[PDB]
Amino acid sequence: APKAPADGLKMDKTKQPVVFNHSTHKAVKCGDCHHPVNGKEDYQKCATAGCHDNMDKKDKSAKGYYHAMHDKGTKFKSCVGCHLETAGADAAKKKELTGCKGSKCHS
Ligand code: HEM
Ligand code: HEM
Ligand code: HEM
Ligand code: HEM
Numbered sequence: 001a002p003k004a005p006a007d008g009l010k011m012d013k014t015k016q017p018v019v020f021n022h023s024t025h026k027a028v029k030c031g032d033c034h035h036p037v038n039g040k041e042d043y044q045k046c047a048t049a050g051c052h053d054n055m056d057k058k059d060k061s062a063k064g065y066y067h068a069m070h071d072k073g074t075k076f077k078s079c080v081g082c083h084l085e086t087a088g089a090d091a092a093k094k095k096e097l098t099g100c101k102g103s104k105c106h107s
Contacts, residue, residue, distance in 0.1 A: 035076045
């Protein structure tokens with residue numbers, strides 16, 4: 001069975017890189033992020049060719065990498081989508097978890 005990697009993973013496909021820590025996401029099943037593709041949970045890097053490899057941040061199709069990390073109403077939760085739900089009405093948590101700058105994702 002796949003094992004989570006070490007904390008401090010840098011997502012760095014863009015000029016706004018973001019650190020991801022598995023240890024803070026244990027309340028989330030692995031396959032909610034490493035989601036099924038052709039019926040099997042896929043543990044490849046999200047931006048693998050044929051996956052979320054479109055680096056046009058304006059693309060709203062499934063292959064758009066920005067879209068996959070930021071948008072609501074997606075088939076699997078995005079980073080920002082799930083964080084918005086988590087923050088609820090708490091403005092401090094909305095800033096920490098969903099702010100576009102000065103958040104835990106982007107400085
Ligand atoms: C569940 C305990 C779980 C496992 C297992 C797991 C594994 C895993 C691997 C093996 C990697 C490395 C991939 C590589 O080859 O680079 C990896 C990377 C990322 N993960 Fe993960 N992961 C588990 C859980 C979760 C959860 C719950 C989320 C989403 C909240 C998540 C996300 C990520 C992300 C993002 C990465 C980086 C991918 C990248 O493209 O570099 N994982 N995980
Ligand atoms: C990496 C951990 C990773 C993330 C994060 C992720 C997210 C993601 C979202 C949010 C969606 C929904 C988009 C929408 O509804 O518009 C989505 C959908 C698909 N993904 Fe993905 N995804 C990650 C990893 C991977 C990998 C490694 C591949 C390629 C093997 C891949 C592919 C796809 C496909 C295909 C879809 C659409 C699925 C369907 O319609 O059932 N993703 N992903
Ligand atoms: C998507 C790849 C993604 C990123 C990036 C991400 C980041 C992130 C950070 C930076 C934190 C703060 C703690 C830390 O420094 O590790 C954090 C915390 C929470 N997250 Fe997250 N997160 C990503 C995705 C997801 C997904 C898809 C969910 C829900 C399904 C989720 C949830 C949470 C929760 C819960 C926390 C803790 C919140 C807190 O108040 O402490 N994240 N994540
Ligand atoms: C707030 C809604 C918000 C904005 C706006 C935003 C912007 C942003 C940009 C411009 C990029 C780079 C896109 C490109 O291709 O040039 C980027 C990248 C990532 N972001 Fe973001 N972002 C906002 C908020 C958040 C939050 C709160 C998280 C974490 C939950 C987050 C995550 C990510 C991830 C992951 C990336 C990709 C990192 C990489 O691979 O380089 N964003 N964002």
